[PDB]
C-alpha cells in the first residue's frame, strides 16, 4: 500500500525559544501514548520575494495542533496575522490549536478568539506542560 490517506496528522505551532519543550512534550505522544506522528514546522528564513500561496488545505488536514506563545509575542501582527487560519480561517472541527496564556482577558489575544475555549494557565502554574494537558481533552473527539 502507497496510497496515502493524509499528509500531516500533527503539528506544533511554537517560537524557537521552547524549540526543547515542544519536542519534549511532542516526543510522549510521540511514544506509545497518541501513536501519532506530530511534526514542528517553525518559520524559516525564505529565500527573498514572497506571494499569496493558495488555500493551504494541508494544514487543515491535520487533526490537532498545539500553540504555546507568551501573551506579549503572540501580540505581535505576525501571529495574529498567521493564526488567522486558527479565528475564522479554519476547515471546521480539524487542526484545533491549543494556544496557552498566562491568565489574558483579551488583553494579548484578539476577541476572535472569543468561543467555548477559555485560555487555561493563568499565574506560574506550569502552563508550559499544561500545553500537554490541553490537547488531551481533544482526543475525548475519539470516545
Same mark, same amino acid.
Given at each position: 500500500?502507497?496510497?496515502?490517506?493524509?499528509?500531516?496528522?500533527?503539528?506544533?505551532?511554537?517560537?524557537?525559544?521552547?524549540?526543547?519543550?515542544?519536542?519534549?512534550?511532542?516526543?510522549?505522544?510521540?511514544?506509545?501514548?497518541?501513536?501519532?506522528?506530530?511534526?514542528?514546522?517553525?518559520?524559516?528564513?525564505?529565500?527573498?520575494?514572497?506571494?499569496?500561496?493558495?488555500?493551504?488545505?494541508?494544514?487543515?488536514?491535520?487533526?490537532?495542533?498545539?500553540?504555546?506563545?507568551?501573551? @506579549? +509575542?503572540? /501580540?505581535?501582527?505576525?501571529?495574529?496575522?498567521?493564526? =488567522? *487560519?486558527? %479565528?475564522?480561517?479554519?476547515?471546521?472541527?480539524?487542526?484545533?490549536?491549543?494556544?496557552?496564556?498566562?491568565?489574558?482577558?483579551?488583553?494579548?489575544?484578539?476577541?476572535?478568539?472569543?468561543?467555548?475555549?477559555?485560555?487555561?494557565?493563568?499565574?506560574?502554574?506550569? @502552563? +508550559?506542560? /499544561?500545553?500537554?494537558?490541553?490537547?488531551?481533552?481533544? =482526543? *475525548?473527539? %475519539?470516545?
Amino acid at each position: 500500500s502507497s496510497r496515502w490517506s493524509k499528509d500531516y496528522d500533527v503539528c506544533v505551532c511554537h517560537s524557537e525559544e521552547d524549540l526543547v519543550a515542544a519536542q519534549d512534550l511532542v516526543s510522549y505522544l510521540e511514544g506509545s501514548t497518541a501513536s501519532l506522528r506530530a511534526f514542528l514546522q517553525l518559520r524559516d528564513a525564505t529565500p527573498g520575494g514572497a506571494i499569496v500561496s493558495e488555500l493551504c488545505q494541508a494544514l487543515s488536514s491535520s487533526h490537532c495542533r498545539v500553540l504555546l506563545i507568551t501573551p @506579549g +509575542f503572540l /501580540q505581535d501582527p505576525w501571529c495574529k496575522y498567521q493564526m =488567522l *487560519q486558527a %479565528l475564522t480561517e479554519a476547515p471546521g472541527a480539524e487542526g484545533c490549536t491549543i494556544p496557552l496564556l498566562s491568565g489574558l482577558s483579551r488583553a494579548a489575544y484578539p476577541p476572535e478568539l472569543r468561543f467555548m475555549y477559555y485560555v487555561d494557565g493563568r499565574g506560574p502554574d506550569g @502552563g +508550559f506542560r /499544561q500545553v500537554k494537558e490541553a490537547v488531551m481533552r481533544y =482526543l *475525548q473527539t %475519539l470516545s
